[PDB]
């Protein structure tokens, strides 16, 4: 199994114990590290943060401490939107300019591949032709990577993609059978499946549906989404299940109604480190849990929730990570990906569960820190 760990280049700005940079990553926890995010200007890949060049070097230097480790650079993300991708895929000239720039950039800085995180082809302003043009891009990139490996006599750069977990976005965005042939791995965003924007409490990454859910609400769970990808053409071994190391917060409209589906008035309060209303890192969650919150196991969905007065949290913990890891092995998927390693209790000082408690849970469950043949 693989364990793919996203690192974000804005975690460094968080105050105090929240600041996280590549040298804080345990090089043995994951099989692959993915750097989020690069940008694009005039159809060429580029940096975004002022010190990305320095961070790229520290990130790829982690491979000097783990000979099995591979790194990828992710391009795009939610804030980046779709317009640069639409322009880039619109012509063969622009796709070639982009692919050439990617090979050069990955080799320049020491990355082993590119993770495409276009959110999403065919949505958020992207026109309908982008569904097929995304396939064309990926095919052309895979072929260019295959050719560069032979010409340079080196292991091939990998092409992966982070892909939607919502059924409407999946159907508008992806030609699953052909796309899956050319991607090396498919990183499915099986999280953000509920949130305060819906007006009621719900879980971030529930494994199964809640018993009341019918119609399209019955699709909002990890099991349905991963099986949708598999059943519509993606091989199980290329499918990577998304695991969030964060939770979503809500304000309860009625504090006496604190189960699933309780009406809410908006996002919960921003945490002091991540400073984003509606979102808490796992280490911020532990502070909440230890400050008088009531924790409930949502047995139908195999995830915890917690509440305190009018604050409600849908999240994941060691138990839910363990349950979902057991399930992914039972279903022969390729592994797990975490959003994001900088949200784990990397110092160990918030949760009293050791360093990197959520990431370590997946490393142990998926046999990541193991060997087969004796070696030098
Ligand atoms: Mg964030």
Author numbering: 22 to 397
What did the study's authors say about this model?
One of these proteins, Acidic Mammalian Chitinase (AMCase), is an enzyme known for its ability to function under acidic conditions in the stomach but is also active in tissues with more neutral pHs, such as the lung. AMCase is a member of the glycosyl hydrolase family 18 (GH18), the members of which hydrolyze sugar linkages through a conserved two-step mechanism where the glycosidic oxygen is protonated by an acidic residue and a nucleophile adds into the anomeric carbon leading to elimination of the hydrolyzed product. We found that mAMCase has maximum activity at pH 2.0 with a secondary local maximum at pH 6.5, pointing to a bimodal distribution of activity across pH. Mutations Lys78Gln, Asp82Gly, and Lys160Gln result in the loss of surface-stabilizing salt bridges in hAMCase and may contribute to its reduced activity at more acidic pH. It is likely that the dual pH optima of mAMCase is intrinsic to the catalytic mechanism, where Glu140 can be protonated directly from solution (at low pH) or through proton shuttling across the catalytic triad (at neutral pH).
